[PDB]
Amino acid sequence: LALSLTADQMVSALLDAEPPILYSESMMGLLTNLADRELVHMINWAKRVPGFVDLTSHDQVHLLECAWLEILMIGLVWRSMEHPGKLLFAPNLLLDRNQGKCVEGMVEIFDMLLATSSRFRMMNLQGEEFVCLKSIILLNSGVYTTLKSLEEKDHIHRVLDKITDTLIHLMAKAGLTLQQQHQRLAQLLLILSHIRHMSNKGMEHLYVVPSYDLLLEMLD
Amino acid sequence: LALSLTADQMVSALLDAEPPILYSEYDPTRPFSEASMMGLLTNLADRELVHMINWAKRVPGFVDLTSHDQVHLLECAWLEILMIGLVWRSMEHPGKLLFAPNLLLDRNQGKCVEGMVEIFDMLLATSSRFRMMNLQGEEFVCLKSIILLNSGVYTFTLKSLEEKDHIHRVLDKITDTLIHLMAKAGLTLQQQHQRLAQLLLILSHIRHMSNKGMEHLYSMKCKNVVPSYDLLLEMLDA
Ligand SMILES: CC1=C(c2cccc(O)c2)[C@H](c2ccc(OCCN3CC(CF)C3)cc2)Oc2c(O)cccc21
Ligand SMILES: CC1=C(c2cccc(O)c2)[C@H](c2ccc(I)cc2)Oc2ccc(O)cc21
Numbered sequence: 001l002a003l004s005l006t007a008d009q010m011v012s013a014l015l016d017a018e019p020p021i022l023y024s025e026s027m028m029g030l031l032t033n034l035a036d037r038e039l040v041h042m043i044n045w046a047k048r049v050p051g052f053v054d055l056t057s058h059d060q061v062h063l064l065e066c067a068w069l070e071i072l073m074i075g076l077v078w079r080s081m082e083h084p085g086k087l088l089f090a091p092n093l094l095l096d097r098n099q100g101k102c103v104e105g106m107v108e109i110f111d112m113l114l115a116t117s118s119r120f121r122m123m124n125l126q127g128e129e130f131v132c133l134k135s136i137i138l139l140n141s142g143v144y145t146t147l148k149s150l151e152e153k154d155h156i157h158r159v160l161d162k163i164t165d166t167l168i169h170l171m172a173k174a175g176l177t178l179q180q181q182h183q184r185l186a187q188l189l190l191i192l193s194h195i196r197h198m199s200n201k202g203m204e205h206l207y208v209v210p211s212y213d214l215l216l217e218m219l220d
Numbered sequence: 221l222a223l224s225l226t227a228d229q230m231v232s233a234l235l236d237a238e239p240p241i242l243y244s245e246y247d248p249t250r251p252f253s254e255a256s257m258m259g260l261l262t263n264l265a266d267r268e269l270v271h272m273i274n275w276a277k278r279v280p281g282f283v284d285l286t287s288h289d290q291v292h293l294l295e296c297a298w299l300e301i302l303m304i305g306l307v308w309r310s311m312e313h314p315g316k317l318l319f320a321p322n323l324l325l326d327r328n329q330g331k332c333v334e335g336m337v338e339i340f341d342m343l344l345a346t347s348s349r350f351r352m353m354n355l356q357g358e359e360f361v362c363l364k365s366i367i368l369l370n371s372g373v374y375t376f377t378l379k380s381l382e383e384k385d386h387i388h389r390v391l392d393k394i395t396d397t398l399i400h401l402m403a404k405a406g407l408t409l410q411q412q413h414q415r416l417a418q419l420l421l422i423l424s425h426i427r428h429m430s431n432k433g434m435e436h437l438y439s440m441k442c443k444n445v446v447p448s449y450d451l452l453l454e455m456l457d458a
């Protein structure tokens with residue numbers, strides 16, 4: 001059924017799955033409390049990504065274990081798009097570069113986050129595109145790791161071809177030429193490589209992580 | 221000159237500029253210790269790096285950048301670049317990595333170094349994926365150039381914006397080149413989009429392997445790992 005979705009239906013479902021923008025309640029305390037609350041919505045958001053519930057729980061948890069920080073980051077970067085120089089962690093928590101210095105080592109990631117946000121800005125990324133990218137992150141990041149082993153990986157890649165299709169359909173409908181569609185597709189997906197980088201540097205900086213058993217409980 | 225190339229001229233440019241396959245140090249002690257295996261791999265990686273600098277200077281658009289940005293892009297990209305070279309070389313060797321034609325290692329010989337087994341398995345997996353996708357050489361040289369230009373672009377003023385804008389134009393051209401090969405090979409427009417995406421999603425995996433690898437090299441206290449920024453600017457000169 002997830003494989004039979006049209007482009008419009010794919011977008012419509014992902015737009016409906018979007019978690020809410022939460023509010024903040026030492027600076028690590030705030031961000032952590034916040035990220036924990038965003039995490040719970042993310043689990044329930046992931047179950048509404050088409051094709052995700054068609055996976056075993058082992059593979060749902062593995063995809064979530066490899067993607068959770070990329071997912072928080074792309075959401076953060078998206079929120080902040082219309083607030084240059086600042087990171088809109090929450091509407092009552094708009095931090096700038098310099099306030100990143102409050103915590104040692106945080107400055108570096110803060111600046112990468114900002115740059116991404118500026119990149120999305122000057123590409124003028126759309127909310128329709130955003131939700132497609134966020135799902136690609138979910139499905140794509142942990143997939144490169146028996147009877148179920150091959151069938152699941154194939155399913156995931158066929159879904160990903162569908163989100164590709166969606167992204168293209170959206171671009172065509174927006175008035176982009178074929179060449180322009182290809183290019184914008186590549187530009188968006190190359191930015192994902194930067195978000196992986198940021199996720200690894202942030203995951204390193206946090207050394208405070210969802211364990212395999214932890215996430216398995218939340219799906220159920 | 222760079223943005224005036226055609227698809228065909230771009231491929232040829234990148235194909236001609238490919239660096240050579242090199243051999244490991246000959247007649248090392250086998251089996252290896254955790255030290256000697258790293259010594260062989262490190263001697264080999266260092267030697268590849270010199271060829272990579274001269275390769276980087278032939279990727280269209282790269283020399284058009286100031287010297288500070290060229291060194292920045294290489295700092296960010298060098299291990300990703302060494303890793304995709306490896307993955308490619310190891311495509312027709314299931315379950316094995318072809319570090320050198322005289323150094324073909326399986327999963328078990330990665331256990332010889334604490335922590336390498338993990339990275340090893342990520343490299344094998346990526347290698348299989350290229351095999352199943354049937355990655356061509358023409359596509360490979362585009363992906364390699366894409367890693368070089370893109371990995372560091374989002375991390376560096378009127379001119380600092382001119383340099384980004386330029387890099388993205390070249391990148392936009394390598395993308396056209398990728399598509400043009402896919403069309404020339406006779407894939408449908410849909411198939412073309414899906415393959416382009418599958419390929420660029422893999423770069424995301426390569427970046428993850430490169431960060432982990434970078435973490436691993438720092439882990440076992442290798443003084444010094446990584447080409448320092450100091451080091452690459454030396455080699456970039458003439
Ligand atoms: C990019 C970013 C942060 C960010 C992330 C890394 C570095 C950095 O400088 C900022 C921290 C953060 C992220 C994750 C985090 O996870 C903690 C793990 N949880 C505690 C539970 C187990 F005890 C699971 C803590 C802080 O705050 C955020 C948010 O609140 C919401 C969205 C993005 C971020
Ligand atoms: C991927 C890789 C290494 C590798 C693989 C797994 C883990 C790891 O830390 C390094 C290791 C390496 C050792 C020292 C340095 I300085 C750089 C790379 O040896 C290599 C040689 C050539 C090559 O193309 C890739 C590698």
Ligand SMILES: [Cl-]
Nearest residue numbers: 018127128130
């Ligand atoms: Cl939205």
